[PDB]
Every structure is written in structure tokens, then in C-alpha cells.
């Protein structure tokens, strides 16, 4: 059965809920972006519309089967109605095509829905604006103080200079880059890009990249892995073993191999700075864990909540432990006492 957390007061709305077989009361299933835990339960069978930005509806009408129409894309920072209610989507900095829902009730309530989200300062200057939010569902995977992590461009940073770097010392250097799902794409992209080659990678995540729009894709990825010198593979493949069988399958192309595994937080961030990361070495083989976060720190978070100023905040990630509820709850109370509101 559905959670609460997943329904949205006033509506027959329902929020990335695929998964409980047909809600009661539900006219429209929202979906904020195409990742695996919120998806769950959709596929060509499934009969009611769903709501969601373009890239999703590409994703699932190319990678799901859903037909087309079932399919209702709508564009971001515009205004549409939705079953007789006001909805907008905005960016919400997570993966490509995240979402998060803005809810105009009829009775004059307005309700904030993250989705899964990266907070930031140019959230201050959106649609958010120009009104206030009484109900906010956050999302708070990173809800406690030690989870710190730096910014996306300087672990880009890093990336580029190591793999820059290692190829220049040893033009035989193959790197390779860990992947699971959507989201992340700079890291791959943006080492290809100071390497002048192409990302190789399979059919079926060349698939799943050109259904994203980014611009002059065509010239960054590639299914001819002879070609390219940064290959992806899946992230369960990003281990010694995994390493070394990939080497040998490039014919003596290669005798190194440098990869990366973009993880979002590690324990290793509560001692460590991005400039003293070092890699795990086996042989002609490292492995770099690198923090790049597509959800927010818990600086990022309490700052645009201490913005929005919400009247009642609804968490929906960590929220199977009564620990964990109180400690948000201790938090989310804090926040609104060194603010004000
Ligand atoms: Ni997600």
C-alpha cells in the first residue's frame, strides 16, 4: 500500500508511486525523474497517465515501452493544469530530466515536492520566488551535519588533471568509468573531452544517453570501444578482477588502466579534502572513489529550507527508523529557530 508520503492532500495526485498496483483515489501518477526506486512498477501494460518533464517521457517510452499515450511531458517553468490544478516542474540539479513539482491547491495551499534534488542558490530565483510554500516533501538523504562533500565542479576538477595527467605520462593508459543509471554524466564527458577521444560504452547505455538532449551528444559517445580511450562499464564491474578481465579483452592495446567511481558520500570526506584523494592500486591497476553528489550536503539543505521557510516539512528518504525521524525532526527544528519563522 501506498505510503502517505507519496500522496499529495486535496488532489488525486500521487508522486513517484508505481509500484502499489492502482492507488485508490489517484487520476494522475507524477514521476520526477527516471531512476530505478521511483520508477519501480511502470511498463508498456501500464493505463493512466503520467505526468513528468520531457527526458523522462523519453526514457520511458524508449526504455520502459510505456505507450505513447499514457505519456504527458510537460515543459519546465510553465504553468499548466493538471486534472483542474495548477502544476509547475523546475530543475531540481539531480540527473537528467529530475524534476521537482510545484502544487497550487484549490483551496489556496501551495506545496513544494523536491523530488530526489542537489540544492542551490539559483533555486532563489525561480518560479519559488514569487509565492509562499505551506507543505514542503524534501529530500533528505544527506539530513546530518557530517555528510560534507565538495562542489561537482571541483571534483571535475580533479578528475581532469588526473586522468590528463596519467595519459600523458602513458599514451597506453586506458580509463575506464563506473556507471549504474542515469545521472553523472559530467565525470565521463568531461575527461573524454581533455582527452580528445569519444566515451565507448554499450548498445544499451548508448541508448539510454541518446535519450537525454544534450547538445552535440553524437560528437561525445560511441558504441566502437576500439575507437575510444574512456570506456563505461557497470559500476559492479569497477574492482581488480572486473579491471584486469576488461584489460585483456583490448587485444595488448592497453597495459594501464586508470578508473573511476563516482560513489556520493564516503567516510573517507569527514578527514579528507578533495586535492589529498589517492587511489587504490593492484598492479598496472588504480581505482579513484570519487564524492561527486547529485543530493544536497546538509549545509546546501538547511540553507534553502531556512530560505523557503515552510510551515510543515514532510521527509520521504530515511524514514523506516524512528532514530532517523528524530533526528530530521531535531534538525528541521533548529533550522526554524536560528531563522526565525
Ligand atoms: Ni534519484
Not at 497550487?104 to 530565483?125: C, K, Q
Not at 533528505?140 to 588526473?162: D, G, H, L, W
Not at 543530493?295 to 514532510?314: A, C, D, G, T
Request: glycine share 6%; proline share 5%.
Amino acid at each position: 500500500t501506498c505510503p502517505f508520503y507519496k500522496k499529495i492532500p486535496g488532489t488525486g495526485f500521487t508522486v513517484d508511486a508505481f509500484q502499489y498496483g492502482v492507488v485508490e483515489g489517484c487520476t494522475a501518477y507524477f514521476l520526477t525523474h527516471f531512476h530505478s526506486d521511483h520508477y519501480a512498477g511502470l511498463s508498456k501494460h501500464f493505463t493512466f497517465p503520467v505526468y513528468c518533464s520531457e527526458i523522462t517521457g523519453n526514457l520511458l517510452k524508449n526504455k520502459l515501452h510505456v505507450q505513447e499515450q499514457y505519456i504527458h511531458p510537460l515543459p519546465l517553468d510553465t504553468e499548466c493544469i493538471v486534472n483542474g490544478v495548477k502544476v509547475v516542474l523546475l530543475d531540481a540539479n539531480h540527473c537528467p530530466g529530475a524534476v521537482m513539482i510545484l502544487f497550487y491547491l484549490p483551496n489556496g495551499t501551495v506545496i513544494l515536492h523536491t523530488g530526489d534534488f542537489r540544492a542551490d542558490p539559483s533555486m532563489e530565483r525561480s518560479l519559488l520566488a514569487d509565492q509562499k510554500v505551506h507543505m514542503l516533501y524534501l529530500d533528505t538523504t544527506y539530513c546530518s551535519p557530517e555528510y560534507t562533500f565538495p562542489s561537482q565542479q571541483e571534483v571535475i576538477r580533479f578528475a581532469i588533471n588526473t586522468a590528463f595527467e596519467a595519459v600523458t605520462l602513458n599514451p597506453h593508459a586506458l580509463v575506464v568509468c563506473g556507471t549504474y543509471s542515469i545521472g553523472k554524466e559530467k565525470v565521463f564527458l568531461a575527461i573524454a573531452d581533455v582527452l580528445g577521444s569519444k566515451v565507448g560504452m554499450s548498445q544499451e547505455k548508448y541508448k539510454t544517453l541518446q535519450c537525454l538532449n544534450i547538445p552535440e551528444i553524437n560528437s561525445l559517445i560511441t558504441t566502437d570501444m576500439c575507437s575510444s580511450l574512456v570506456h563505461l562499464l557497470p559500476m559492479m564491474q569497477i574492482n581488480f578482477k572486473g579491471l584486469q578481465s576488461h584489460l585483456k579483452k583490448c587485444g595488448g592495446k592497453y597495459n594501464q588502466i586508470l578508473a573511476f567511481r563516482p560513489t556520493g558520500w564516503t567516510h573517507s570526506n569527514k578527514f579528507t579534502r578533495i586535492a589529498d584523494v589517492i587511489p587504490q592500486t593492484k598492479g598496472n591497476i588504480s581505482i579513484y572513489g570519487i564524492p561527486y553528489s547529485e543530493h544536497s550536503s546538509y549545509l546546501e539543505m538547511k540553507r534553502f529550507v531556512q530560505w523557503l521557510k515552510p510551515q510543515k516539512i514532510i521527509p520521504t528518504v530515511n524514514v523506516g527508523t524512528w532514530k532517523s525521524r528524530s533526528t530530521m525532526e531535531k534538525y528541521f527544528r533548529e533550522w526554524k529557530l536560528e531563522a526565525g519563522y
